Amino acid sequence: YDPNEKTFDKILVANRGEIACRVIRTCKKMGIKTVAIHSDVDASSVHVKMADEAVCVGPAPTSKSYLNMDAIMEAIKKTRAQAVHPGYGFLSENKEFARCLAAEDVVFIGPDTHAIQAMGDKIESKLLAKKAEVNTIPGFDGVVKDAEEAVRIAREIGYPVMIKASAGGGGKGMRIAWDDEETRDGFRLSSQEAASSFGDDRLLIEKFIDNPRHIEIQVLGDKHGNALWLNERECSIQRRNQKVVEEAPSIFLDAETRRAMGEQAVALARAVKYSSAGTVEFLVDSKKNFYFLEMNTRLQVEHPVTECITGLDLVQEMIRVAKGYPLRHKQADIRINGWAVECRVYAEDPYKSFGLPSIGRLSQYQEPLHLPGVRVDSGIQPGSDISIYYDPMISKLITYGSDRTEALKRMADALDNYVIRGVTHNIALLREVIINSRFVKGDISTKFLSDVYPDGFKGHMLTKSEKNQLLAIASSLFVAFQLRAQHFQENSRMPVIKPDIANWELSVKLHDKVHTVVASNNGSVFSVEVDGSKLNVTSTWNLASPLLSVSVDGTQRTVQCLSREAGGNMSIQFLGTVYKVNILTRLAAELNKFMLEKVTEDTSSVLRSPMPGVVVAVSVKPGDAVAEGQEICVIEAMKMQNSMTAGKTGTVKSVHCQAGDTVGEGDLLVELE
Amino acid sequence: ATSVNERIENKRRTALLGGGQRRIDAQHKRGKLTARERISLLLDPGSFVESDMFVEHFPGDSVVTGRGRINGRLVYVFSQDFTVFGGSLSGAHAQKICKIMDQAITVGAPVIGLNDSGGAQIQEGVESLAGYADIFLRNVTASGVIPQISLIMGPCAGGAVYSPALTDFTFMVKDTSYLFITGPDVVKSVTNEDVTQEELGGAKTHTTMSGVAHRAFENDVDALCNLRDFFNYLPLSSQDPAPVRECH
Amino acid sequence: DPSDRLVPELDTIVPLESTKAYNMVDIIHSVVDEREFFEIMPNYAKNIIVGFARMNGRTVGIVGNQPKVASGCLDINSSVKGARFVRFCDAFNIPLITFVDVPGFLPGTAQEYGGIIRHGAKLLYAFAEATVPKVTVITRKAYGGAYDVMSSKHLCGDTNYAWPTAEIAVMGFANPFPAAVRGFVDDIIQPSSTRARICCDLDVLASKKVQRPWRKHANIPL
């Protein structure tokens, strides 16, 4: 971080989200003017405000805003930007972008083009790697044209079969085939889907490694032929073939095999003449055998975690390399310093298919920056909007420590002290993963989520002690609210005679069980009797702060009160999971037995229009099954656009509401089963 | 030579004639009188005292305000005539009306308002809304203190139709008076129905089904005569008992 | 709940283009103490929102427009719903907070035949008669006499504020500056400071006394 060295004066970050914020931060920290591009929707995002100047580039969709080649080119033209930084995704690995940038004097901060089209395609990358004397997954080189050829290949490449669409990526077009019939039908369906997904229409058949570990090697190279490998990364916890939880040092690896993998990655990088930061991904089996699989010729999403152990700012190194300066670190200089673990906080519901994207606006957002050893990379601020146009990822949370246990404990504390209200996130899944016994022990594969939760994610299965603690905390909170309700100001006309109730006897309904609780208050200390068990809860009892810190029997806990109703309903986020409880007094509980249960499920197979209007836009297509709280269509009425949500989970039979069709109140909008 | 006297005479003659002989004549072919003629018919002969006749925005400011006597009892009146000029209930118009209500509430005498928006530009400056708000505040303040009577003698539209509603009694003139917030053209633009002005806000609509107006009279002279007769019933203020007259 | 808590969520809650709507209940929840709000008539005349909340521990009555429902336009039902709530809050010394996004009155022949004039006058009377402290915040729109309806400065509105997206005009001068230069709004505040500002005002106006002429009772346009 020496400003004396001459460096590019203007850098334009052609990206959005947390990566743009990170690039802007590291450019500001070395004294470089920054330009950030944005769409019309992201006119008030964090990265736009962090930059020195910004220019709108087009409409909401990314196909016309962050992929509008010309618009970015003239955006550079007005601001006379000296360098361009693509981050990851979007235009990071586009050859036409690199060529168009090279047409002018402005330099593209990234790998050279030749490497980009060398590693862009999978078959040629595998052939080069085999020529680069590095281990590769067993298989047949070339493109298989017919299913009979696929089964003939499977005859010798082993019974397990892995079919993968050429090029593309993002966890698409990858399937498992077991039998010959499975091989042929999977090949046929993948060939059919290749045109729809990528259009390359090329497939690869390989040997599927059982219980693999997706290890990653970060490589940094300059234009002088110097290549360095910076430790490793383990990326095993994945759903839909997408990384979720990563660790900087790999607990499986040892010094010798780490050195071997680093040397192989450096040799492969030299064989391609890489001149930036990249990643080489290996699939290490149980027998410490690593096979090369794909090379990302761009900055990695999980790059910050390996910055914690090494202590190096990767983006600064890429900028310096682009300037032309040589590398200031040698292979011996690289060493591991502690442990680091990071997690991806998405805006998705973890209870459906291990995560289903959600939308909404953030009514509350707070990060645990004050906690020890916590770093948050987020392009989100309170009041931000999670739309359907971009990746619904909210943040990246990084925790480092002296060893793995300290890092994991800090990660759990940070997850407990992290506030998101407005959308549905996956913090519960993250906490359950980091506190799982197998993860702590270190035995994890790429099918961790599949076999640990066969049926699916259900939440934190809380034990007897934890259940007693939760019931005690909920009862104490209820009694605290009741006590606060009695604190009025002096009236001097009708003085308030505070009731002298000593013991609150309560009925608490959790899941499908009813518990009897006896709570007593002694100032800031509550004594709770839960079915014979005696608990002692002490706290400051601040009923307005989003985060509440309590001490139950000495054990420190952090809880959140998401919801609270006068009818006794309460939602408590405890140990990362949201639990619904119903607290009543004993008299109210006894009298509740005479209340007849009211059926309200009904059918609701027809969605009557709530307000009269004329439909002008239709967000979905008929026959597309949707869940609750999802966009349907846009109705224009009296110069007002109104958007509704789907009513029932049932499959959409037909979207009756269509553009140009007037739909008055009480008319069917979307037919449901 | 001093031009002050001739300037004063010219100002008085312009205020009396208003917009000219052509404008009063055009008002006459519509079967309606002017503000000053209505005031002369309503009040006792030789009892009207006008206020702020020299205040300009053009003298008069399209409203005639003053005090008079009906059968010997004091009353405060204002009369609107926007056909001559102005076309805006924004500037000194609202100030004059507010001041006349202030005098009435200070003394403790009823207020009679002859509403005739006529040809008024509803697309004028923001001063119109402020004046309307001030007038509404004064009507609410005077409610229950002094009686307030409104006589709609012409087409009243926009936000000005809330001042008559806040008064105690509202009267209309058949075939020449209207009360509506939104014009028929905007109604057709929004609701998409063909409605004429008379059946949207006419006297019959507001006296038979709307329940806004209290009575409808044949024409201006009949309306003013009935207004005098009705005013003879009420007390001058809530501080006074119900009037007692000679009985036979 | 600190009285100076910032609410940065309100900075971008109002869409730039006037053709889009938003939820006023979100603003109300963001501003009030503990995000707790007891709504009155939540399922009737949904184009206006009335309810009880607390600011700095003091009970306040809240009235606002709902641009989601009928573009926030005022009609007979909403006028009657708001008027009685305002009258009750005034009768029992409960301060009033208003959020204004009204584009006008709902046009049509049904509204005229139902007596929209009388019920609009009810709302005007309810806002003008109140002698309790009242604080008004204009979020986006205030058109025509409707702006006069919801406690303009000229109806003895104690303090009036406007967000940078507020726009006051007679008909559909596209900025609040004509209102600011003429004293129609005390200040143009940032949306994130709203709550804080309101609290300060409620601390000042707690000792407000006004004097009005004697009467047995006035004449509501009932």
Ligand SMILES: Nc1ncnc2c1ncn2[C@@H]1O[C@H](COP(=O)(O)OP(=O)(O)OP(=O)(O)O)[C@@H](O)[C@H]1O
């Ligand atoms: N041949 C294979 N054998 C076993 N597992 C595999 C195989 N190919 C892919 N996988 C699994 O699928 C994941 C996806 O790997 P890969 O890098 O090919 O995906 P991608 O969608 O192209 O990635 P990216 O977004 O980084 O370009 C791997 O991490 C691994 O868990």
Ligand SMILES: *C(=O)CCCC[C@@H]1SC[C@@H]2NC(=O)N[C@@H]21
């Ligand atoms: C298009 O149909 C024209 C819209 C005019 C209605 C708007 S909104 C409500 C206000 N009341 C009125 O008469 N015009 C304004």
Ligand SMILES: [Mg+2]
């Ligand atoms: Mg990959």
